[PDB]
Amino acid sequence: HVNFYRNYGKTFKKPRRPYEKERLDAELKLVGEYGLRCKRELWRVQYALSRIRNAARHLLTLDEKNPRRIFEGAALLRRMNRYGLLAEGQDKLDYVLALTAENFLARRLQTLVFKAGMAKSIHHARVLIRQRHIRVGRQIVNVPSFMVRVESEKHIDFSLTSPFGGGPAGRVKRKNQKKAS
Amino acid sequence: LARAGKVRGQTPKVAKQDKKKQPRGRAHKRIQYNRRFVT
Amino acid sequence: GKTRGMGAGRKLKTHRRNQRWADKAYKKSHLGNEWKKPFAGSSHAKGIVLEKIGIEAKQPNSAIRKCARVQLVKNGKKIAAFVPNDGCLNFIEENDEVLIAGFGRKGHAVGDIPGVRFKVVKVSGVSLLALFKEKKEK
Amino acid sequence: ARGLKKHLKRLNAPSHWMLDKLGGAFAPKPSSGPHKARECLPLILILRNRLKYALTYREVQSILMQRHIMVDGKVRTDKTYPAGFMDIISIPKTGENYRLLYDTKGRFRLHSVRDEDAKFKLCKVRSVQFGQKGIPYLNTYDGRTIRYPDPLIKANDTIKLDLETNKIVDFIKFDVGNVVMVTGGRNTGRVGVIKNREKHKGTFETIHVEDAQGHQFATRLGNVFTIGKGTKPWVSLPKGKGIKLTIIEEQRKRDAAAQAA
Amino acid sequence: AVTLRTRKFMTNRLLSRKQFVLEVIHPGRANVSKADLKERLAKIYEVKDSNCIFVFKFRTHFGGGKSTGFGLIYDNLEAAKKFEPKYRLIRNGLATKVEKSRKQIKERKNRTK
RNA sequence: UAGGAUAGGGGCCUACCAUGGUGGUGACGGGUGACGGAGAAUUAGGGUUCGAUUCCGGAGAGGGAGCCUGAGAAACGGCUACCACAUCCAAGGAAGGCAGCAGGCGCGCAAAUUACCCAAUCCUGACACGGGGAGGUAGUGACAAUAAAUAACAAUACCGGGCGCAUUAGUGUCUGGUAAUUGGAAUGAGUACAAUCUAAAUCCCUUAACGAGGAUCCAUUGGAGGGCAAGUCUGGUGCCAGCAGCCGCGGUAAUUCCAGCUCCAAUAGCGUAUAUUUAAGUUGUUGCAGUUAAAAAGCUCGUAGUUGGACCUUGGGCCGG
Numbered sequence A: 001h002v003n004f005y006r007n008y009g010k011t012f013k014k015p016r017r018p019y020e021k022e023r024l025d026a027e028l029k030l031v032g033e034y035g036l037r038c039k040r041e042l043w044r045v046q047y048a049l050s051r052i053r054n055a056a057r058h059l060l061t062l063d064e065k066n067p068r069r070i071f072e073g074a075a076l077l078r079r080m081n082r083y084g085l086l087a088e089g090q091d092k093l094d095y096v097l098a099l100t101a102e103n104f105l106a107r108r109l110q111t112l113v114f115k116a117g118m119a120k121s122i123h124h125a126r127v128l129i130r131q132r133h134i135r136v137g138r139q140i141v142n143v144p145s146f147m148v149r150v151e152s153e154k155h156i157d158f159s160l161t162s163p164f165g166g167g168p169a170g171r172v173k174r175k176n177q178k179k180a181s
Numbered sequence B: 001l002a003r004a005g006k007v008r009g010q011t012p013k014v015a016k017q018d019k020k021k022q023p024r025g026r027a028h029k030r031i032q033y034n035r036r037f038v039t
Numbered sequence C: 001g002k003t004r005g006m007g008a009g010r011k012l013k014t015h016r017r018n019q020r021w022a023d024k025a026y027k028k029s030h031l032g033n034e035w036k037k038p039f040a041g042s043s044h045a046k047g048i049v050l051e052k053i054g055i056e057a058k059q060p061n062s063a064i065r066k067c068a069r070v071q072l073v074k075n076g077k078k079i080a081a082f083v084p085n086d087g088c089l090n091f092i093e094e095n096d097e098v099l100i101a102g103f104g105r106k107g108h109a110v111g112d113i114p115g116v117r118f119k120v121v122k123v124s125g126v127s128l129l130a131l132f133k134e135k136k137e138k
Numbered sequence D: 001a002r003g004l005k006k007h008l009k010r011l012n013a014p015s016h017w018m019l020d021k022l023g024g025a026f027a028p029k030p031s032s033g034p035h036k037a038r039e040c041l042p043l044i045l046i047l048r049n050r051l052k053y054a055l056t057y058r059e060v061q062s063i064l065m066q067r068h069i070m071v072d073g074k075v076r077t078d079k080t081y082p083a084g085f086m087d088i089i090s091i092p093k094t095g096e097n098y099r100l101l102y103d104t105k106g107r108f109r110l111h112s113v114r115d116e117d118a119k120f121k122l123c124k125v126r127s128v129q130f131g132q133k134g135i136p137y138l139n140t141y142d143g144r145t146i147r148y149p150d151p152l153i154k155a156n157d158t159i160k161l162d163l164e165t166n167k168i169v170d171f172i173k174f175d176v177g178n179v180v181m182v183t184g185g186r187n188t189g190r191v192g193v194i195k196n197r198e199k200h201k202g203t204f205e206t207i208h209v210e211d212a213q214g215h216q217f218a219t220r221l222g223n224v225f226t227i228g229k230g231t232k233p234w235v236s237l238p239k240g241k242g243i244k245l246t247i248i249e250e251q252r253k254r255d256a257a258a259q260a261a
Numbered sequence E: 001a002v003t004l005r006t007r008k009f010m011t012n013r014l015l016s017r018k019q020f021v022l023e024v025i026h027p028g029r030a031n032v033s034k035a036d037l038k039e040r041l042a043k044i045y046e047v048k049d050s051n052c053i054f055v056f057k058f059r060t061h062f063g064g065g066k067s068t069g070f071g072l073i074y075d076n077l078e079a080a081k082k083f084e085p086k087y088r089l090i091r092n093g094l095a096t097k098v099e100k101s102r103k104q105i106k107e108r109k110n111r112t113k
Numbered sequence F: 001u002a003g004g005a006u007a008g009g010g011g012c013c014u015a016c017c018a019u020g021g022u023g024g025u026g027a028c029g030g031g032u033g034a035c036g037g038a039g040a041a042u043u044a045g046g047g048u049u050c051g052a053u054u055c056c057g058g059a060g061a062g063g064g065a066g067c068c069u070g071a072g073a074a075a076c077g078g079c080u081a082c083c084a085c086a087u088c089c090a091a092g093g094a095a096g097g098c099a100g101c102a103g104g105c106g107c108g109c110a111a112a113u114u115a116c117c118c119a120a121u122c123c124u125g126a127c128a129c130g131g132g133g134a135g136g137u138a139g140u141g142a143c144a145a146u147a148a149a150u151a152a153c154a155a156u157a158c159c160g161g162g163c164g165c166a167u168u169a170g171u172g173u174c175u176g177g178u179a180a181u182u183g184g185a186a187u188g189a190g191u192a193c194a195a196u197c198u199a200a201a202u203c204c205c206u207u208a209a210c211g212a213g214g215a216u217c218c219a220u221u222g223g224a225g226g227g228c229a230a231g232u233c234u235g236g237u238g239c240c241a242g243c244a245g246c247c248g249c250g251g252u253a254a255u256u257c258c259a260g261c262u263c264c265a266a267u268a269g270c271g272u273a274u275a276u277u278u279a280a281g282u283u284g285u286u287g288c289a290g291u292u293a294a295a296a297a298g299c300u301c302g303u304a305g306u307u308g309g310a311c312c313u314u315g316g317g318c319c320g321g
């Protein structure tokens, strides 16, 4: 029976010590300050960070001039630079270890909407994402964890169908208009 | 075996109110955020 | 001290095989008596209750923990099982069809109930938490 | 089990077939043929998966039953034919010739050739020995048997065969210093010049080869294959002239192709 | 105001068709029906016979307005008769289907003679 | 050694002869709730446990045994016989083998449709056309995994902290909320013209018109003594009922039970049971301990085992970056 063969895995991990004031309030800091749906999203971010830091740690373990070191060091660095998650003049493969979950949370599309305006709130940013109000190049995106690359960051803009930036007015508009008319 | 259900029958019957729902999901973490350390 | 010769792999491997047996967990897990317990390597077990009994509680406490003598349909063991809710024993009745699960501490007596390792989690095919919470009556 | 296995499952398929994983349960199961059947490509993989002239099993069946697809001088209508190394696959309706060679990363390309270097093929010999009535014959790794061999053509050597005279026209003596290209393992695809050959009694003979630009490697005898005498090949090499390039180098190629446009 | 552009386009005179992936751009419109694609694609290629066309496997990408699919310009309707699966000829009305009831189709028939 | 048999080597078997083969480096024997492997879970490293299962190999078709055909079978969707089971009989006879798909009984803590299809992947035949419960599609499917809704924004308000003077005020900025307060916006859940999807339908993706006043288009699971996050709330019960993984609570002022409010952790998930990994430097080769906490044999000899003192020219140079 094929389609048994389609792989799939887990994306987060529940924390080791469930009830800690320090971690609990730090995670509430982050979840409220980025307006997230729950702490699953945050835990995905530590999982991705854990993955990349394991890779970077293993790369730093080796020595330079080692072709394995150079190759996926450069691959990891160009991945980071495509996500703009490192700044210019900062490609050293240690500033990958330096970065923290705030960096990933800052690239999510909600945050980018908030920082480009067009939301008037970060929770308003999330909802605008999920009501098909925003495209990237031409395709309307509704996943608030979209992880925009800088080559797409410049022209993140409304859809051509959303009432705010595109075409016809919404259903509340048209009910009010038709009962006025 | 005589005394089974004693206190759970002793207690008076009372009913809830008709509370307004609290927000779920994002909005619930919102109220927690801006209620713990925004106020 | 230890034997650390470069050629002592046989001695060290035999010695760990020999000395893991003093470990209680390994001995319990591989000795084969877990298949001689009542559940015999099962998580739960459907059984038939013989009677609602009620039993004493241990020295510091003083109470009557309401248990039942159940028979196992699978291999005929007769055991004692607790009923974990307030006044929940009434739902149980003689010769009803119950599901018996481990009572915690992994096959070892729990709390002040003397020598009882089992709990009732279903009766007559209805959830006992649901019975307690009037969600569904049998 | 109790007989020949007649189904082949996609994961069990050779890794150089490139074929995907959720594409189905089964793979073409190349029929018994003239080439080693783990080192081969079915003509269904030649048609549907590489050239895309069809889109289904049945459309490839239409292709082949039209009698167009002609291999090695004669049409082959089997849809699991084990076409392999320097088999030439011709199509009269497209007037288009292909020849099957390894590319440097261990897989099979269909290199176009014109008619003059499609009138003939080139293959190595397995062994030359006598037959009935003392007539010598030689055996190739393409399976072909040739009687009355030239008294100098020996084992492991290479021979060109036209498709009309259907016999030998010339032969490369497998020896030190002639260009080869490995046909199996991790070094397969890479052409190069034999630089040394050491023999150990009772085991595989080892061939040390040097590529056109400095790199050196080793290989077993069953995998190497002389092409031409000296450095010059007698066959049209693919877009990579048989040099396997290190991953860093191939990253630089794509970076330079990006920054050139 | 919807447009139609085709790429990955290749001719096969082994089966004498013109096979391509079409990338229709249909903004505002929900999606464009194949029966309506037929005559546009016919009138751009001058096929002289708008029935050799067969188009299939459309997606209508997430977000709408852009749809993919396959197109197969046959040159002879005779070629499209012989070299084609039956189902989409049946779809375009060039053949008809019959229903099965598999009892006695072979089993109790294998018993008498 | 000689032969017989096999497709073929061979004590595989026969005749004769020799007296050998394995073992403390564990044979033989016994257990295995043991098919093997690729691998799975967990993992700082090392490891520990698992691996029936879709990939490869082997073995079986109720239990044994024996053969026909055939290139290929000791075949079981082939036969013969026995044993267990069972069906039809008009009472002589006859047909059997779902550990194939689906489905029924039983066993159980434990596992779905007596569906559609050859269109795809391939197989098969005398064969471009037939066939294919292989295989795909669809229905049940909180096994597991992924994205991810349950509102958002504004001024009004009793108000609530600076910031414009900051006295003496008073109202002020992000709005913090008790606001079913007021208000127009946004939408998908759902309904659904149609098209697309499909072998044909169905789902998804698009999208005519419909589709939100907060009672609803209502989020739950468990917990509120310690661990361990969150009541020195209120009522009831009174060593009882009961809770409680452990420590413990309950003997009329219960932070621990039964209830209501509030709250908390996780959140479309969570609790429970068993088994297993971590914790566990509580199996320790890395890496434990043995005076007194469990542990140096009473003492010496002693074979295997383990471990074994020092000593042997690349000694000094050129040469090229």
Ligand SMILES: [Mg+2]
Binding pocket: C024, C025
């Ligand atoms: Mg232990």
Ligand SMILES: [Mg+2]
Binding pocket: C060
């Ligand atoms: Mg005690």
Ligand SMILES: [Mg+2]
Binding pocket: D001
């Ligand atoms: Mg088989």
Ligand SMILES: [Mg+2]
Binding pocket: none
């Ligand atoms: Mg012999």
Ligand SMILES: [Mg+2]
Binding pocket: F034
């Ligand atoms: Mg077994």
Ligand SMILES: [Mg+2]
Binding pocket: none
């Ligand atoms: Mg198998």
Ligand SMILES: [Mg+2]
Binding pocket: none
């Ligand atoms: Mg068999």
Ligand SMILES: [Mg+2]
Binding pocket: F076
């Ligand atoms: Mg048999």
Ligand SMILES: [Mg+2]
Binding pocket: F077, F098
């Ligand atoms: Mg059968």
Ligand SMILES: [Mg+2]
Binding pocket: F098
């Ligand atoms: Mg079955």
Ligand SMILES: [Mg+2]
Binding pocket: none
């Ligand atoms: Mg609750």
Ligand SMILES: [Mg+2]
Binding pocket: none
């Ligand atoms: Mg409680």
Ligand SMILES: [Mg+2]
Binding pocket: none
């Ligand atoms: Mg309480």
Ligand SMILES: [Mg+2]
Binding pocket: F229
């Ligand atoms: Mg606390």
Ligand SMILES: [Mg+2]
Binding pocket: F245
């Ligand atoms: Mg508990």
Ligand SMILES: [Mg+2]
Binding pocket: F256
């Ligand atoms: Mg408690």
